[PDB]
Design a protein around this ligand. Structure first.
Ligand SMILES: CCCCCCCCCCCCCCCCCC(=O)OC[C@H](COP(=O)([O-])OCC(O)COP(=O)([O-])OC[C@@H](COC(=O)CCCCCCCCCCCCCCCCC)OC(=O)CCCCCCCCCCCCCCCCC)OC(=O)CCCCCCCCCCCCCCCCC
Ligand SMILES: CCCCCCCCCCCCCCCCCC(=O)OC[C@H](COP(=O)([O-])OCC(O)COP(=O)([O-])OC[C@@H](COC(=O)CCCCCCCCCCCCCCCCC)OC(=O)CCCCCCCCCCCCCCCCC)OC(=O)CCCCCCCCCCCCCCCCC
Ligand SMILES: CCCCCCCCCCCCCCCCCC(=O)OC[C@H](COP(=O)([O-])OCC[N+](C)(C)C)OC(=O)CCCCCCCCCCCCCCCCC
Ligand SMILES: CCCCCCCCCCCCCCCCCC(=O)OC[C@H](COP(=O)([O-])OCC[N+](C)(C)C)OC(=O)CCCCCCCCCCCCCCCCC
Ligand SMILES: CCCCCCCCCCCCCCCCCC(=O)OC[C@H](COP(=O)([O-])OCC[N+](C)(C)C)OC(=O)CCCCCCCCCCCCCCCCC
Ligand SMILES: CCCCCCCCCCCCCCCCCC(=O)OC[C@H](COP(=O)(O)OCCN)OC(=O)CCCCCCCCCCCCCCCCC
Ligand SMILES: CCCCCCCCCCCCCCCCCC(=O)OC[C@H](COP(=O)(O)OCCN)OC(=O)CCCCCCCCCCCCCCCCC
Ligand SMILES: CCCCCCCCCCCCCCCCCC(=O)OC[C@H](COP(=O)(O)OCCN)OC(=O)CCCCCCCCCCCCCCCCC
Ligand SMILES: CCCCCCCCCCCCCCCCCC(=O)OC[C@H](COP(=O)(O)OCCN)OC(=O)CCCCCCCCCCCCCCCCC
Ligand SMILES: Nc1nc2c(ncn2[C@@H]2O[C@H](COP(=O)(O)OP(=O)(O)OP(=O)(O)O)[C@@H](O)[C@H]2O)c(=O)[nH]1
Ligand SMILES: [Mg+2]
Lengths: 459, 49, 347, 99, 120, 320
């Protein structure tokens, strides 16, 4: 992984040593080159994972998450450089540095062989994320959002640290390959119940699990646009990636310990989907949409079937591109009208025709139109959950109806009807904005041609 | 001359500069010497060639 | 003070501590504490005001009471063993007395009340000595008598210190009071692991000293003693706000910073001894400290508080305080986690 | 007036000073280069060449090999009157049951 | 735990038996990281005193790197010595107490019974 | 060797440099009292260093190239705007007074540092000790609020306690009607708007508060407008003073070392002039102060510590 870690680190001197007026050009160009080389991680084998060294490895689960991560950095630089245009040079460079450091921690997080190396980098991502939210967020609420983000994550992750060290003392190793062969079944005792919760709650909070999600509508809404993109696209998926890994050592206890969290997710997805119908803040609506989608990933991971694991991997990738696109679309309106209220600016299809096409495509992927990879992931999860219990099709079916309703409600409210008379500063869409949207949707639809590369290790 | 008052660091402290560079050279030479003897003594005690 | 006399007094503070650390005889340990207390009182009184006199008096009363209890423990130990060797004590009553005496000297809860008040009442440089160098001698004694220490007593003192330190710091706006409660909380980690692995007591002590030294030095560089006076730093020395941010996050124990290392290594040792509940409780309770460290970062680095017009005059002059070792300390306070296995040099 | 604070600046229209703006930078030359690197490295390189690279991945995860291997085994086993597949994954003669 | 080692030459940074161990390589990645920390300290020193960060006082920056690398080298020698001593003690004890560390007669998976927990 | 404890231990002690001529003299009086003319005369005859009265740009004159800086780097303090609109709601009146107190505080530390380091006496025109007369005059005319006076007294309380008062206070007494006549002669359009009520309040503060207080700790010499013209007589009187009161007699090398350590570090001098008391007159929002601070560093010779600025011809930076 050093062929990706070292180039990522070099983005920092590149940013600091660049000419003042070339910081965005230079960092964007070279971050795209790194993203291009990440395609070499697609050398996956049917039986064995691609094991680089004692520290790092990549299998079909981490590889797509790595490619998404490295793809997101140039998109975030494009999304940020407009609203940071009046920031002074040194603070711009520090903003880019936080983004680079977050990428460094993420790519090492997804390839860490040892769960305690995974833990340190998994917590490490908090620091740059907190700084981005609180320093460069726009509203007073960013300070409160940072505290909710920080202490929800740590309340869960500190018990995880105790559990992981306990496992290493008992097994002798936290190396993930070793745990595949030395894993022992978990006896059903009270002490193992709390080991199970310690190993899972930190990941549940990051998903987020319904009930433990209050940090997300604060953090995702108060962050700057780059903060929201990475928060929704990648950082929510650390929880899914962590759960997909750690459930290996929790069988068979997951059979019954899953029930309370499956109920929270199956009912929670309907609750959060309903909330979207009455949200007044466009960014807040998009944030609650993420909670509903990640409820499917939680359920898929907990029922532990080959189909649910393929579906979960696809959804995580599909949601990452879609939710990031929606935040970027919402941000482009915000940079014009300087409000997040959804009813403020209406009929934007009349004033911004091409941008209204991006809204439509973003909405259709969000409601999982076939054959998008959003639908492929959702379908595979619904199939596996039907086998877990036929009755689940009712909750899955209702959620798909509600999801269509709020996805198109967002489209209709903002893009259709009559334009707001007094809003007269809706200038034409910039080339930058149009390129930013198409760099989300084009890869998303291309993956429909070759879905296997985002179906994970069970494929 | 630009400054109304002569800065304390208007010109180099050539004494400190000389003692700073000499100290770096000494430590580097001493460190290399130490390392070479440790390798020699490690080889002698382990009967290595 | 005459600068030469100030140097001699500081060297005597160090000599008292060194005597405690090299002594094999209980009388010489007691003498080291006496010498140390005598030499530190002047540096607390050096600015001559009623608050400095009150702090010196409160400190003197606390330390003198502790030193009499220490001597009582030594004499009881002599009566039941006929010897003076600094080692495990041979009577449970002597053990309790010495443990309490050392807890009083450390300012551990519930013997903690003097630490916030004494620190607040003295200059920043004196507070730096009080919260760093003064911990060395009591810790070095605890390091040698720990096999005879009552397990419940020492763990009770640790839990209370972590709780009181965390809660006490939440209500503070004075920087010196924040550092005092932070010291009390960090004290509880050092003693909590002492029964299991005294080497991790030393690791936490060293890293705590480095981070605390870094914080006091940065507070001294701008002569800031309150939260609101520190909130002006962004408009005078912006680099200092970044350094303060990194150190405060490190003191909060956040990965991948240096301050996580002691918490990480202590949790490991306690879990090896089947102590699961206590490290989990300690780790969670430490979130209190992270909260009032984060509050400082909000008012110092991550937002910009209102400035004053006269601040413009300060822009025209350079920092002339020595800030000794600050570049080295701040790097060690933050970037040492990759070198964690080096803790074996303390074994 | 309460504190001395600057009034909020009015929002600048990039098109006003540069009707050909791409939205990347206020400097027209830097603005054009930012567009070119994004479109070249973004679409020409990553999306086009990356799409081609993915399309020609050498038997990703052994699926084509497995099909050829399955054909070989089915041909062999049917040509010898053997079952196409057996319920036991492991030979029972290597297994020692309890009791 | 290792304070009273039988062969502990007390209050010695590197006892003589440490000379039997291979020295850290001057290209050791941990030593390179220590040098990097020294270089960061040099940059911070310029920053807090408002000198040009990268160019100011190259002599001072060099002494930051040298002193960190110099101290780092000896700390790594002691670090490696202390882990060598830990392993030496562990293996000697295991030899002296064979009754406490018996070689297990360990069976194949064909012989050992593990319960099956269906995932359905 | 830069002064410090080591230089002190090596024999750099103030009692060696100072003599019976090492006196700190301040000349006070009302506006247009001729205090400035006398102060230059006293300084020359006695061989003392003269400090022109600290104005808005005194600090500029001691740093950088020594030339005044644009007004936004003083906060837009304007003496002229104080005379055109003393009740302006932008807070200029107290913002000016607070800035001038800090300027005098800086100048006083500069005067002490010269006196202690070189042993030569100094002559000042007004000081931090008499600065309050203008504050009282502003307050009594309603130019500033009572909160502003409280802020000033808070700042003065924790700054003036650190210094020694002048050896000699020379007051030039000129009646208000004569001062008013002399202002008209000087022909300054803004200064001509000063009222007799304002000038009278300055006089009342000088005679009711200042002179009684300084008499207990300094040698106070009073002169009419006519007597002050004869600087030879004034200098003669200063030379035959006894100097038998005041804290200067209780000073030794140890206490002067501590004083010198303070006055040399100008950020320690100004530390409390910016206490976080949010008074609208002196409070600046983050957006404004952020903007102005960045422009300050963009000035010639201001980006880096003095001696590290290539744009003004500094050399050997890679070895400094
Ligand atoms: C013997 C071998 C050599 C050891 C030397 C021992 C100390 C004697 C020399 C210091 C006095 C001197 O030279 O100048 C007098 C001189 C007196 O003249 P003055 O100006 O008229 O009086 C002003 C006031 O008296 C003072 O001025 P101020 O009030 O404005 O502030 C002074 C401040 C200003 O100093 C600074 O610039 C800020 C940086 C100081 C903190 C950094 C120290 C290192 C931190 C730990 C890392 C280890 C290194 O310095 C201090 O705070 C004094 C205490 C410094 C020690 C702090 C305790 C650190 C804990 C050590 C733990 C070690 C174990 C770790 C595991 O004033 C000074 O210069 C004071 C600063 C001295 C240099 C920096 C501090 C000493 C160097 C660190 C030594 C570390 C060893 C532990 C010391 C323990 C002491 C209890
Ligand atoms: C065994 C020995 C191996 C270590 C060598 C230590 C030599 C360092 C001596 C540097 C020194 O003069 O300290 C002055 C120093 C005053 O400078 P400062 O406040 O510490 O900050 C640096 C100044 O900018 C520096 O101010 P400057 O402009 O005056 O720098 C010129 C200075 C050269 O001074 C420097 O270049 C300062 C940078 C040297 C490195 C700082 C010490 C680091 C010590 C190693 C720390 C180990 C890190 C832990 C290991 C890695 C983790 C495992 O020239 C010399 O004095 C040459 C040294 C003659 C011997 O005060 C003291 O250290 C003693 C009190
Ligand atoms: C209706 C629309 C037009 C339909 C055209 C159909 C014909 C197209 C031809 C075709 O099928 O193509 C061949 C293949 C599918 O058919 P194929 O699998 O049979 O391949 C044909 C070639 N042979 C015969 C050798 C196997 O298409 C692809 O493989 C395209 C894959 C693109 C997906 C990768 C996109 C690159 C993204 C870069 C990374 C940055 C984004 C972030 C990614 C997130 C993490 C993953
Ligand atoms: C002037 C010297 C001042 C030193 C005294 C003031 C500082 C005392 C507190 C130090 C920081 C807190 C404790 C650190 C413990 C680390 C000790 C260690 O591991 O190394 C000791 C090592 C190993 O000694 P050891 O193996 O016998 O045991 C050390 C003591 N325990 C285990 C309890 C920590 O010894 C040496 O370093 C050799 C002695 C060299 C003496 C040189 C002194 C400096 C003068 C040059
Ligand atoms: C006489 C013996 C008593 C101890 C020495 C006290 C006087 C030493 C001296 O003159 O140096 C002053 C110096 C004064 O320098 P300084 O450290 O206070 O500051 C540097 C000088 N300025 C600030 C001006 C740049 O103090 C020392 O640094 C000496 C420290 C070592 C003290 C002696 C250690 C003895 C170890 C046993
Ligand atoms: C809103 C806040 C958000 C945060 C949520 C936090 C969720 C934490 C949940 C922790 C609960 C963990 C369970 C601890 C109880 C002990 C578990 C146990 O060991 O019981 C075993 C037994 C298994 O039963 P059985 O399947 O029959 O055994 C195998 C034979 N077939 O036990 C069983 O019968 C299995 C069933 C256990 C689950 C019970 C579910 C209760 C009903 C659903 C509640 C949903 C969650 C409610 C949250 C509200 C919080 C205010
Ligand atoms: C990390 C942050 C902590 C701050 C760093 C402190 C730096 C300590 C410097 C140690 C390097 C000293 C190099 C000197 C080597 C030398 O050439 O001289 C040898 C001399 C002792 O010689 P000696 O072995 O005792 O006698 C020979 C007879 N056999 O050498 C000596 O005198 C020994 C010097 C004493 C060293 C004390 C022990 C150092 C360990 C400090 C704590 C380390 C904290 C590690 C934290 C782990 C997490 C990163
Ligand atoms: C892990 C890596 C951490 C490395 C820490 C490096 C040391 C600390 C920062 C040093 C840079 C600094 O303090 O000042 C910023 C500096 C501004 O430059 P300037 O003031 O104009 O000086 C003239 C430059 N020749 O910037 C410069 O122009 C010099 C180039 C270096 C800038 C380094 C940026 C540091 C940001 C690190 C944040 C944490 C990373 C994660
Ligand atoms: C002989 C005299 C005595 C002193 C000799 C000591 C030298 C060694 C001390 C360290 C100094 C390293 C060299 C620093 C070069 C700085 C030169 C410089 O400041 O010029 C700036 C240069 C070009 O920048 P420019 O194009 O002019 O403007 C861009 C606007 N943004 O920008 C640059 O190109 C600077 C490039 C960065 C500097 C190099 C970074 C070095 C990293 C060191 C890592 C340490 C690892 C240690 C491991 C050791 C293990 C054994
Ligand atoms: N508001 C205010 N104005 C001040 C202050 N000090 C001086 N001034 C003004 O600065 C101007 C010049 O000060 P003066 O020295 O008293 O006037 P002058 O003409 O020089 O009189 P002489 O020097 O004695 O001959 C006057 O208009 C004063 O009002 C002050 O502390 N506050
Ligand atoms: Mg005048």
């Amino acid at each position: 992984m050093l062929k990706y870690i070292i180039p990522t680190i070099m983005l920092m001197p590149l940013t600091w040593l660049s000419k003042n007026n070339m910081i965005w050009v230079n960092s964007t160009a070279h971050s795209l080159l790194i993203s291009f080389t990440s395609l070499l991680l697609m050398n996956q084998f049917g039986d064995n994972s691609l094991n680089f060294s004692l520290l790092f490895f990549s299998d079909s689960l981490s590889t797509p998450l790595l490619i998404l991560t490295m793809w997101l950095l140039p998109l975030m630089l494009m999304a940020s450089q407009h609203h940071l245009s009046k920031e002074n040079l040194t603070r711009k460079k520090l903003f880019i540095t936080m983004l680079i450091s977050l990428q460094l921690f993420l790519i090492m997080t997804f390839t860490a062989m040892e769960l305690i190396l995974f833990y340190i980098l998994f917590e490490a991502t908090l620091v740059p994320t907190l700084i981005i939210i609180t320093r460069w967020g726009n509203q007073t609420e960013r300070l409160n959002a940072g505290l909710y983000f920080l202490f929800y994550t740590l309340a869960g992750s500190l018990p995880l640290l105790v559990a992981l060290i306990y496992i290493q003392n008992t097994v002798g190793s936290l190396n993930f390959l070793m745990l595949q062969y030395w894993v022992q079944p978990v006896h059903n005792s009270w002490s193992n119940v709390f080991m199970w919760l310690a190993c899972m709650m930190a990941f549940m909070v990051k998903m987020p699990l319904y009930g433990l999600h209050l940090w997300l509508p604060k953090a995702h809404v108060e962050a700057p646009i780059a903060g929201s993109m990475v928060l929704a696209a990648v950082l929510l998926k650390l929880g899914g990636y962590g759960m997909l890994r750690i459930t290996l050592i929790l069988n068979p206890m997951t059979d019954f310990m899953a029930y309370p969290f499956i109920m929270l997710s199956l009912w929670g997805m309907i609750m959060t989907s309903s909330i979207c119908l009455r949200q007044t803040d466009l960014k807040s609506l998009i944030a609650y949409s993420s909670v509903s989608h990640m409820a499917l990933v939680i359920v898929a991971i907990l029922i532990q079937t080959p189909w649910s694991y393929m579906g979960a991997t696809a959804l995580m990738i599909a949601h990452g591109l879609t939710s990031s696109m929606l935040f970027c679309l919402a941000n482009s309106n915000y940079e014009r009208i300087h409000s997040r209220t959804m009813i403020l600016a209406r009929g934007l299809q009349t004033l911004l025709p091409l941008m209204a096409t991006w809204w439509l495509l973003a909405s259709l992927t969000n409601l999982a139109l076939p054959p998008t990879i959003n639908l492929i992931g959702e379908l595979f999860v619904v199939m596996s959950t039907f086998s877990w219990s036929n009755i689940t099709i009712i909750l899955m079916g209702v959620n798909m109806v509600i999801t269509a309703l709020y996805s198109l409600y967002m489209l209709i409210m903002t893009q259709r009807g009559k334009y707001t008379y007094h809003i007269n500063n809706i200038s034409p869409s910039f080339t930058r904005e149009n390129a930013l949207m198409s760099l989300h949707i084009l890869p998303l639809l291309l993956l429909t041609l070759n879905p296997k590369i985002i179906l994970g290790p069970l494929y | 001359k630009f400054y109304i008052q002569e800065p304390p660091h208007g010109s180099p402290n050539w004494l400190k500069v000389g003692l700073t560079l000499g100290t770096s050279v000494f430590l580097w030479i001493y460190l290399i010497k130490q390392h070479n003897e440790d390798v020699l003594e490690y080889k002698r005690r382990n009967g290595l060639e | 003070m005459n600068p030469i006399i100030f140097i001699i007094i500081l060297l005597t503070i160090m000599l008292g501590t060194i005597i405690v650390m090299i002594s094999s005889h209980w009388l010489l340990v007691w003498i080291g504490f006496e010498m140390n207390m005598l030499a530190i009182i002047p540096i607390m009184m050096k600015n001559h005001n009623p608050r400095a006199t009150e702090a010196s008096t409160k400190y003197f009363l606390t330390q003198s009471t502790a030193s009499m209890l220490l001597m009582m423990a030594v004499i009881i130990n002599l009566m039941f063993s006929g010897q003076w060797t600094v080692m495990k004590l041979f009577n449970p009553m002597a053990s309790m007395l010495m443990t309490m005496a050392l807890a009083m000297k450390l300012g551990m809860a519930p013997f903690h009340f003097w630490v916030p008040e004494v620190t607040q009442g003295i200059p920043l440089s004196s507070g730096l000595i009080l919260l760093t160098w003064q911990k060395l001698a009591p810790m070095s004694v605890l390091y040698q008598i720990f096999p005879s220490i009552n397990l419940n007593l020492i763990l009770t003192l640790s839990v209370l210190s972590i709780l009181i330190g965390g809660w006490g710091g939440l209500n503070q706006t004075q920087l010196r009071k924040i550092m005092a409660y932070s010291s009390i909380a960090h004290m509880g980690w050092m003693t909590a692991v002492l029964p299991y692995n005294p080497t991790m007591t030393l690791l936490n002590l060293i890293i705590y000293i480095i981070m605390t030294s870094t914080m006091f030095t940065m507070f001294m560089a701008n002569s800031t003693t309150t939260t609101l006076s520190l909130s002006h730093t962004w408009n005078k020395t912006p680099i200092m706000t970044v350094l303060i941010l990194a150190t405060l996050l490190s003191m909060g124990g956040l990965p991948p910073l240096s301050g996580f290392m002691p918490k990480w290594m202590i949790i490991q040792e306690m879990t090896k001894n089947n102590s699961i509940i206590l490290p989990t409780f300690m780790a969670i309770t430490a979130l209190l400290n992270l909260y009032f460290y984060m509050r400082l970062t909000y008012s110092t680095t991550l937002t910009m508080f209102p400035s004053t017009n006269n601040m413009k005059m300060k822009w025209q002059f350079p920092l002339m305080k020595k800030m000794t070792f600050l570049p080295t300390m701040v790097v060690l306070s933050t970037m040492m986690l990759p070198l964690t296995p080096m803790l074996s040099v303390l074994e | 007036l309460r504190w001395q604070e600057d009034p909020e600046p009015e929002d600048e229209n990039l098109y006003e000073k540069n009707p050909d703006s791409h939205g990347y930078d206020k400097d027209p030359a830097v603005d054009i280069w930012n567009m070119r690197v994004v479109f070249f490295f973004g679409f020409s390189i990553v999306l086009v060449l990356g799409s081609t690279f993915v399309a020609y991945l050498p038997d990703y995860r052994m699926q084509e090999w497995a099909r050829r291997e399955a054909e070989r085994l089915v041909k062999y086993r049917e040509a010898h009157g053997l079952p196409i597949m057996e319920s036991n994954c492991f030979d029972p003669s290597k297994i020692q049951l309890p009791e | 735990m290792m304070t009273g080692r039988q062969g502990r030459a007390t209050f010695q940074f590197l006892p003589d038996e440490a000379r039997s161990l291979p020295p850290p390589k001057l290209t050791d990645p941990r030593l390179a990281f220590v040098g990097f920390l020294g270089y960061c300290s040099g940059l911070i020193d310029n920053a807090i005193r408002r000198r040009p960060v990268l160019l100011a006082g190259l002599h001072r920056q060099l002494l930051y790197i040298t002193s960190f690398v110099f101290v780092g080298y000896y700390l790594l020698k002691r670090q490696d010595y202390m882990y060598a001593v830990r392993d030496h003690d562990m293996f000697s004890y295991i030899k002296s107490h064979p009754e406490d560390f018996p070689e297990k007669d360990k069976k194949t998976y064909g012989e050992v019974f593990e319960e099956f927990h269906p995932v359905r | 060797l830069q002064y410090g404890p080591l230089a002190y231990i090596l024999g750099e002690k103030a009692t060696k440099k100072m003599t019976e001529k090492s006196k700190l003299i301040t000349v006070d009086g009302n506006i247009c009292s001729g205090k400035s003319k006398l102060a230059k005369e006293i300084a020359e005859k006695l061989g003392l260093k003269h400090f022109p009265e600290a104005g808005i740009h005194y600090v500029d004159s001691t740093t950088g190239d020594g030339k005044p800086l644009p007004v936004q780097f003083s906060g837009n303090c304007s003496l002229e705007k104080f005379y055109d609109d003393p009740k302006s709601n932008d807070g200029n009146s107290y913002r000016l007074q607070a800035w001038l107190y800090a300027s005098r505080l800086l100048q006083y530390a500069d005067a002490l540092e010269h006196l202690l380091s070189t042993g030569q006496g100094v002559v000042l025109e007004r000081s931090i000790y008499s600065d309050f007369v203008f504050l009282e005059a502003m307050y009594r005319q309603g130019f500033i609020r009572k909160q502003c006076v409280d802020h000033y007294n808070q700042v003065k309380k924790v700054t003036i306690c650190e210094y020694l008062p002048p050896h000699v206070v020379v007051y030039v007494d000129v009646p208000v009607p004569e001062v008013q006549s002399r202002i008209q002669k000087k022909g300054n359009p803004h200064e001509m708007k000063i009222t007799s009520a304002y000038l009278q309040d300055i006089e009342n503060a000088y005679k009711g508060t200042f002179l009684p207080e300084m008499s207990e700790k300094c040698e106070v010499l009073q002169y009419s407008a006519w007597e002050a013209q004869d600087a030879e007589k004034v200098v003669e009187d200063i030379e035959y003073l006894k100097y038998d009161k005041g804290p200067w007699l209780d000073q030794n090398d140890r206490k002067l070392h501590k004083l010198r350590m303070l006055v040399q570090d100008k950020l320690e001098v100004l530390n409390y002039t910016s206490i976080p008391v949010f008074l609208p007159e002196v409070t600046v929002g983050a957006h404004q102060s952020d903007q102005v601070f960045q422009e300050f560093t963009e000035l010639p010779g201001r980006k880096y510590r003095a001696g590290y600025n290539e744009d003004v011809g500094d050399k050997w930076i890679w070895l400094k």
